[PDB]
A = this chain, B = another copy of it.
Amino acid sequence: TTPSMEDYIEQIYMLIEEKGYARVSDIAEALAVHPSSVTKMVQKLDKDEYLIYGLVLTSKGKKIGKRLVYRHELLEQFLRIIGVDEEKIYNDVEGIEHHLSWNSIDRIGDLVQYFEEDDARKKDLKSIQKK
């Protein structure tokens, strides 16, 4: 499960949910890569049984894809809550998402919940930045 493989699974999952299907051409455009690079990964994803062949995810691929989408969203919410400039959030998440253990993701989930459940906490955090 490499970072690249994860980016592909996350994108395929999102396209299926968005359009109802995922074409190699839409993946190439979404990730800004050459279609041959897409064909190579797709074959690896099929061999590793994450999907079949247009592109259809297996239960294995769907489970991981849902987790990857959840992880990405959680991390954007994390950086957003702590005050990171919105414009910078996507690129940072795209890079760090692949290097956090599930344990760290669980704890970041708790941290997000901590601030989401009581706005007063968000206000107090903001006060720190103000200094």
Set B108, B113, B129: member contacting A110, Cβ < 8 A: B129
Does A2 touch B at the CB level, under 8 Å? no
A114 vs B95: C-alpha distance when bound (angstroms): 25
A contacts with B: majority SS: helix
**B99 pairs with A95, CB closer than 8 A:** yes
Task: Give the number of times this chain occurs in the complex, counting copies.
Answer: 2
Say which residue of B83, B91, B96, B113 sits within 8 Å of A128 (CB atoms). B113
Query: B128 to A104, Cβ gap below 8 A?
Result: no
Known: A107-B129, A110-B129, A124-B114. A99 touches B101 (CB 8 A): no
Q: Mark A81-124, 1 if CB is under 8 A from B, else 0.
A: 01111001001101110111101100110110110010001001
